[PDB]
Amino acid sequence: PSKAFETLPNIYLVGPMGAGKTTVGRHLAELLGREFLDSDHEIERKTGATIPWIFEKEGEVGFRTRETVVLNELTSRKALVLATGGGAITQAPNREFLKQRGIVVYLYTPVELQLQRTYRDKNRPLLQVENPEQKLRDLLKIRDPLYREVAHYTIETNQGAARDLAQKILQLILSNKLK
Ligand SMILES: O=C(O)C1=C[C@@H](O)[C@@H](O)[C@H](O)C1
Numbered sequence: 001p002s003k004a005f006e007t008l009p010n011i012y013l014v015g016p017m018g019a020g021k022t023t024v025g026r027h028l029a030e031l032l033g034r035e036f037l038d039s040d041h042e043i044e045r046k047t048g049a050t051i052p053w054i055f056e057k058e059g060e061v062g063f064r065t066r067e068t069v070v071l072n073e074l075t076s077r078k079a080l081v082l083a084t085g086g087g088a089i090t091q092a093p094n095r096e097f098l099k100q101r102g103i104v105v106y107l108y109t110p111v112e113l114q115l116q117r118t119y120r121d122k123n124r125p126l127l128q129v130e131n132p133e134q135k136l137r138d139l140l141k142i143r144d145p146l147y148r149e150v151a152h153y154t155i156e157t158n159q160g161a162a163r164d165l166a167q168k169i170l171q172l173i174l175s176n177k178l179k
Contacts, residue, residue, distance in 0.1 A: 017118050037081075037082050087143070
């Protein structure tokens with residue numbers, strides 16, 4: 001049906017916790033008639049444990065080693081839209097897999113909106129802290145250049161229909177390519 005887009009590369013969404021990666025990703029996949037996967041959810045599926053449990057029992061290092069293995073595998077698939085984890089771009093091998101194996105889109109999201117969308121979400125181990133706003137801010141200061149460097153496209157998002165943002169991303173990508 002949208003076999004029309006079968007030769008379009010994988011699309012990889014990057015950005016912080018609360019960027020709407022999975023809601024936008026799933027709409028973008030539906031628009032393209034292809035698969036959608038969330039690497040956070042795939043890590044949980046493959047491990048049989050939640051991400052808080054991985055962080056507690058294996059540390060952040062054990063989460064990163066599991067995440068890199070999953071990303072290596074998922075970026076080798078075809079016809080995918082992938083929502084990546086918020087800290088996936090902290091590791092050099094992941095930056096390379098993403099940049100070199102499809103189209104990377106950075107969902108730039110202000111801290112205010114990250115905060116609202118992760119409000120009392122206990123599944124985000126890094127935000128289980130007294131001051132989650134400062135944490136998000138600190139994380140963004142570090143990771144914003146990394147999101148931008150891996151990204152082919154950056155879209156400065158804001159409160160809205162995830163499906164409107166998915167449309168916009170698809171327009172951006174094709175704008176380039178159809179001329
Ligand atoms: O910002 C981060 O480093 C993380 C974001 C989440 O998507 C998970 O991938 C995990 O909680 C770590």
